[PDB]
Amino acid sequence: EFIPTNFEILPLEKEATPYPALIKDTAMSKLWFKQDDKFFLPKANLNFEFFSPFAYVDPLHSNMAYLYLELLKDSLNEYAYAAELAGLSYDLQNTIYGMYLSVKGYNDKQPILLKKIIEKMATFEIDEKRFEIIKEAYMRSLNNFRAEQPHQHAMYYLRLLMTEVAWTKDELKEALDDVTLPRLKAFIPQLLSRLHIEALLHGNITKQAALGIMQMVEDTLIEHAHTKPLLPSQLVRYREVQLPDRGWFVYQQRNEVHNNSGIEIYYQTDMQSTSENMFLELFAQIISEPAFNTLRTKEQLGYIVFSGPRRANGIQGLRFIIQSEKPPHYLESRVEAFLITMEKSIEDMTEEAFQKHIQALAIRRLDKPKKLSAESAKYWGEIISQQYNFDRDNTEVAYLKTLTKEDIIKFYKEMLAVDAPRRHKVSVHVLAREMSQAPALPQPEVIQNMTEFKRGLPLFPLVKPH
Amino acid sequence: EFIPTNFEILPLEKEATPYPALIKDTAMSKLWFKQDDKFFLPKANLNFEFFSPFAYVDPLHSNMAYLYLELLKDSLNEYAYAAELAGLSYDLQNTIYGMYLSVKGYNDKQPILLKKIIEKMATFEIDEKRFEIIKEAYMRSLNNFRAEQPHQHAMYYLRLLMTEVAWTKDELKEALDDVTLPRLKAFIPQLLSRLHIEALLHGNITKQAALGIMQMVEDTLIEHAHTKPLLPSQLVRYEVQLPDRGWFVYQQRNEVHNNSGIEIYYQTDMQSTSENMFLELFAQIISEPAFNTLRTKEQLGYIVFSGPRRANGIQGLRFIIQSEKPPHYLESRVEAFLITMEKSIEDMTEEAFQKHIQALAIRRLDKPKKLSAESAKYWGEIISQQYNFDRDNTEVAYLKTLTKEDIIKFYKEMLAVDAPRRHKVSVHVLAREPEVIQNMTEFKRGLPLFPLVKPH
Numbered sequence: 001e002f003i004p005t006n007f008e009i010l011p012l013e014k015e016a017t018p019y020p021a022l023i024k025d026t027a028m029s030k031l032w033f034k035q036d037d038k039f040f041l042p043k044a045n046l047n048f049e050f051f052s053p054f055a056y057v058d059p060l061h062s063n064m065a066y067l068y069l070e071l072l073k074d075s076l077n078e079y080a081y082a083a084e085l086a087g088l089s090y091d092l093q094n095t096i097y098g099m100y101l102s103v104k105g106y107n108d109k110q111p112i113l114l115k116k117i118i119e120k121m122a123t124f125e126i127d128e129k130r131f132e133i134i135k136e137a138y139m140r141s142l143n144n145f146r147a148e149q150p151h152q153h154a155m156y157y158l159r160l161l162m163t164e165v166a167w168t169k170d171e172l173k174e175a176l177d178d179v180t181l182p183r184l185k186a187f188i189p190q191l192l193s194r195l196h197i198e199a200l201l202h203g204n205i206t207k208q209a210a211l212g213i214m215q216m217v218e219d220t221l222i223e224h225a226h227t228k229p230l231l232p233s234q235l236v237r238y239r240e241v242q243l244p245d246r247g248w249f250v251y252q253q254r255n256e257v258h259n260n261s262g263i264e265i266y267y268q269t270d271m272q273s274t275s276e277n278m279f280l281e282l283f284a285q286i287i288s289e290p291a292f293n294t295l296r297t298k299e300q301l302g303y304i305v306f307s308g309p310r311r312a313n314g315i316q317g318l319r320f321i322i323q324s325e326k327p328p329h330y331l332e333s334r335v336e337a338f339l340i341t342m343e344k345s346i347e348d349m350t351e352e353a354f355q356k357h358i359q360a361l362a363i364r365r366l367d368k369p370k371k372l373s374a375e376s377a378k379y380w381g382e383i384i385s386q387q388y389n390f391d392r393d394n395t396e397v398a399y400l401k402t403l404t405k406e407d408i409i410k411f412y413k414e415m416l417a418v419d420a421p422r423r424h425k426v427s428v429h430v431l432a433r434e435m436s437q438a439p440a441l442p443q444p445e446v447i448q449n450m451t452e453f454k455r456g457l458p459l460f461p462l463v464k465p466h
Numbered sequence: 467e468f469i470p471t472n473f474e475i476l477p478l479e480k481e482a483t484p485y486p487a488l489i490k491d492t493a494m495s496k497l498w499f500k501q502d503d504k505f506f507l508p509k510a511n512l513n514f515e516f517f518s519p520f521a522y523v524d525p526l527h528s529n530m531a532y533l534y535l536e537l538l539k540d541s542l543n544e545y546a547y548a549a550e551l552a553g554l555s556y557d558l559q560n561t562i563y564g565m566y567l568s569v570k571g572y573n574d575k576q577p578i579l580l581k582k583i584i585e586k587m588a589t590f591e592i593d594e595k596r597f598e599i600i601k602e603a604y605m606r607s608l609n610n611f612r613a614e615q616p617h618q619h620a621m622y623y624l625r626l627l628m629t630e631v632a633w634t635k636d637e638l639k640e641a642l643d644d645v646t647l648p649r650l651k652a653f654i655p656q657l658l659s660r661l662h663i664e665a666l667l668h669g670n671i672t673k674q675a676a677l678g679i680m681q682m683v684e685d686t687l688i689e690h691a692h693t694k695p696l697l698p699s700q701l702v703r704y705e706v707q708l709p710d711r712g713w714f715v716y717q718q719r720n721e722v723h724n725n726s727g728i729e730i731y732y733q734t735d736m737q738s739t740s741e742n743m744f745l746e747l748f749a750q751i752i753s754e755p756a757f758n759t760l761r762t763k764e765q766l767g768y769i770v771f772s773g774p775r776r777a778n779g780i781q782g783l784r785f786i787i788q789s790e791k792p793p794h795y796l797e798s799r800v801e802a803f804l805i806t807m808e809k810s811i812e813d814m815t816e817e818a819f820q821k822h823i824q825a826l827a828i829r830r831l832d833k834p835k836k837l838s839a840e841s842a843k844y845w846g847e848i849i850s851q852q853y854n855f856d857r858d859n860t861e862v863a864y865l866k867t868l869t870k871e872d873i874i875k876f877y878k879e880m881l882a883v884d885a886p887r888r889h890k891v892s893v894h895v896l897a898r899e900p901e902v903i904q905n906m907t908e909f910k911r912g913l914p915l916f917p918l919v920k921p922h
Contacts, residue, residue, distance in 0.1 A: 464912065
């Protein structure tokens with residue numbers, strides 16, 4: 001049971017800052033917490049950082065850690081049934097950085113069960129049959145994936161063609177052929193040998209108790225396996241690749257089962273600066289309603305048609321989760337027809353189209369939280385991109401006050417055109433199971449050695465900091 | 467166990483190429499192969515790299531690999547005194563990519579002896595305390611490493627700020643406390659289950675016998691520890707993007723030596739035939755007026771030197787200068803010599819131009835002397851994966867294309883004070899006692915990176 005009656009709403013201190021602040025920082029600690037204002041709730045929601053370098057280095061050890069988390073969160077759920085049944089949810093989630101931890105819920109037993117979870121995942125024991133059955137279950141799950149939907153597997157190539165490295169399912173499939181339990185079983189404390197944990201906290205709790213809870217969990221883990229602090233010289237992030245400034249490249253993927261031919265486009269404006277956010281979103285909104293009016297509705301190229309944003313490596317962009325049975329080059333020509341449509345529509349965006357358009361994106365943008373976790377996921381998105389300007393949305397409003405009609409001339413010429421000298425266009429064909437003005441397009445290449453493809457190209461700058 | 471007896475030399479067959487040829491490539495093996503046409507000597511020298519992803523793992527894994535090879539080469543040396551007594555030598559050396567193997571001497575019984583070497587380093591037992599003495603010895607060595615020369619530490623800067631990532635000696639310092647013997651003793655089969663060996667063979671040697679020898683050796687390797695191959699993207703490579711005009715520097719005061727170190731670096735590019743003769747000719751064309759005035763006339767310190775950088779398949783420009791001076795003061799002197807060459811090259815007429823490009827030619831022009839020197843240049847061809855064995859005549863013919871105006875084109879685009887390709891950067895070292903660089907984290911925080919070189 002563990003006493004949930006301690007629900008008295010804590011009044012905010014003299015330290016009244018409008019956001020979670022870096023209230024505790026050491027070589028191990030980095031602590032972030034503001035409490036409830038719009039809700040005044042007994043719950044609290046929690047967001048927790050894990051990093052290991054080993055979580056990006058091997059398909060073998062990734063499968064290891066993946067199934068490790070599987071049998072692990074599998075285990076204490078027999079305990080945690082009643083507690084989360086007592087309205088105390090939590091999350092263990094694989095990332096490319098490592099795992100992901102997040103806890104939500106009432107202030108019944110939060111530091112206590114918190115500590116129980118920390119100790120439990122800190123020291124855990126393994127059964128060989130349960131090991132091998134979990135192994136075989138996800139083994140049969142692996143080769144299930146080889147026939148996904150073209151838009152789903154297209155999203156896989158989306159996550160695959162926008163990174164530093166991502167190991168394939170074939171990389172995983174040869175890798176499970178040699179897996180033993182003593183291997184990862186010895187490897188796990190080597191796996192967890194050095195970490196930094198950043199803690200995002202929120203709700204009906206105390207600053208000084210949050211300091212003690214942070215010191216608690218770090219001292220607990222040092223007690224377990226003496227996980228030493230990480231290095232700033234090894235906390236690395238990975239970049240998105242630079243095109244040869246007009247070279248747009250593409251390749252094809254003949255599907256096996258589905259006779260629809262998939263294709264999806266992507267672009268690179270710049271970082272989330274003042275200008276480019278509203279550029280991409282407002283542009284996304286002006287390819288929402290007239291394009292939904294025209295291409296999907298008026299042309300009916302196919303059933304699966306999408307047009308929307310795509311944020312990779314802390315860089316936004318523009319995706320089109322569109323699937324039909326067309327010649328994809330012909331469908332590109334349709335796309336180019338839509339680009340000429342937008343060419344005519346630059347001046348044809350009137351005063352009213354602009355005003356309704358900016359106010360609808362503003363209402364899209366402006367939204368107070370309805371949950372204590374609603375803003376927290378978005379804050380977590382700033383966290384995983386290391387941003388922390390929690391009023392950069394106010395900066396977004398200030399730039400939404402700043403776009404002119406002349407800007408989209410400026411945005412089109414060097415960025416959006418075909419003769420665009422700063423053109424960063426991406427497309428990929430995903431072919432089938434069997435598969436009014438034509439501009440002078442430069443013939444793109446075929447992409448065979450993806451290793452040699454992404455081998456020689458540059459990358460993108462990080463932040464002049466805030 | 468071995469004496470060389472094959473000295474009746476084997477004549478050169480149908481293969482009419484004068485170079486190391488890639489005759490075999492599997493998922494594990496890749497055999498660039500040559501036979502002897504110059505000197506007809508019964509020695510055969512061997513070159514083998516041991517790439518591993520486990521290279522950049524830790525400063526702990528650095529010392530693992532390092533001290534592993536160290537004691538490892540020390541251990542079989544107890545076996546290898548008959549070979550040392552035979553005068554038939556070898557090499558084991560680490561890389562920031564992995565390890566390196568050389569085998570040298572006569573072509574008779576190198577495969578079988580080599581197989582013994584491979585088998586013993588694969589099946590190797592570990593002594594506890596002997597290792598501890600070695601551990602403490604390299605500990606005291608790293609303790610001594612903080613008291614080394616600023617020019618030696620300047621070359622350490624050359625390996626330092628010119629990568630994607632490295633480890634520091636302080637990182638190396640605390641991690642020696644973390645060393646246990648079962649850690650690496652269990653990490654060796656962790657190590658040896660996946661790494662790479664590219665094969666290079668050269669000598670009075672046949673083809674199919676060499677195929678069988680290399681296949682035998684890798685078969686033994688897979689027999690013991692089952693070394694599974696890599697992905698080609700798993701052979702990835704480590705350099706800092708510039709703003710291309712802004713000049714950057716930091717100081718790191720010395721502890722022991724009272725002299726101050728300084729150097730200004732300039733990356734041009736890859737080793738394109740353009741940038742090769744740019745760098746070489748420009749470096750040597752400033753070298754002799756430097757010998758005229760800065761070294762001889764000024765006499766600031768004795769350790770004053772200028773040279774090129776050739777690493778990562780990437781060119782560079784160095785100035786080995788160690789002397790206790792005020793920093794900006796010596797900066798202004800080097801700047802003054804930049805002005806000196808700016809006028810002096812324009813002052814150099816066609817005569818010294820032609821004699822000096824002839825000097826660079828005869829620098830470049832030298833006949834083979836042994837397999838070792840050509841093989842060292844071959845190894846440089848290997849490590850950046852370029853193999854251009856006939857860039858000699860090519861870069862010479864390119865050298866003929868450079869005029870007095872052509873080098874001015876090389877000046878003002880890149881080397882002017884307002885040049886947009888001003889690749890200017892420095893590192894200060896103080897005594898034993900623009901803008902500033904905040905952090906090395908800030909040094910590698912906000913950056914693009916480079917296109918990579920097409921391999922061969």
